[PDB]
Design a protein around this ligand. Structure first.
Ligand code: HEM
Ligand SMILES: [C-]#N
Length: 153
């Protein structure tokens, strides 16, 4: 679990992200695919965006990216007790999309990299440590949840 000081670090940067969420989302999905091309294959709807350019141009990618971060910010806002918001995510990711935990850690690292790039003066060492720990808590709990649905991860 994180301490409240850590949580203050996390939610402080998150407040800086929200006014530009969509552009943050978009860049996370694109960087995901670029740096770990095998993840693209889990997405039937984006199967055909083979070039980088096309990805940059897709309205669907941007809206999917926004959806992703929107879910993530509700979970981070519940701090250590985020059961209820996490459950339905773990359910869809375990039974419908089937995404391994290794792919979850890949996106996590890319979220931290994107924010760091976009907030060079407010995302310092304490904050990146705290955000890394919040996302690690989210991956861990997703991984526990997954077992309740019959999925290994
Ligand atoms: C780690 C942060 C993640 C979050 C917060 C996130 C969140 C979401 C949300 C809110 C949705 C749509 C509603 C739902 O189906 O539950 C979703 C869709 C999906 N997620 Fe994720 N996701 C995460 C990571 C991943 C990863 C790493 C992958 C694949 C490598 C992935 C693949 C998908 C798929 C395939 C869909 C369906 C998209 C469609 O409608 O066609 N998710 N995700
Ligand atoms: C969501 N990927």
């Amino acid at each position: 679990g994180l301490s409240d000081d850590e949580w203050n670090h996390v939610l402080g940067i998150w407040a800086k992200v929200e006014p530009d969420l969509s552009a943050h989302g978009q860049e996370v999905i694109i960087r995901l695919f670029q740096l770990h091309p095998e993840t693209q294959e889990r997405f039937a709807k984006f199967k055909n965006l083979t070039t980088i350019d096309a990805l940059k141009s897709s309205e669907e990618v941007k809206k999917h990216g926004t959806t992703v971060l929107t879910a993530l910010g509700r979970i981070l806002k519940q701090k250590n007790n985020h059961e209820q918001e996490l459950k339905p995510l773990a359910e869809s990711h375990a039974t419908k999309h089937k995404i391994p935990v290794k792919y979850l850690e890949f996106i996590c690292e890319i979220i931290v990299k994107v924010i760091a790039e976009k907030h060079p003066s407010d995302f310092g060492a304490d904050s990146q440590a705290a955000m890394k720990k919040a996302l690690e808590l989210f991956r861990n709990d997703m991984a526990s949840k997954y077992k309740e649905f019959g999925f290994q991860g």
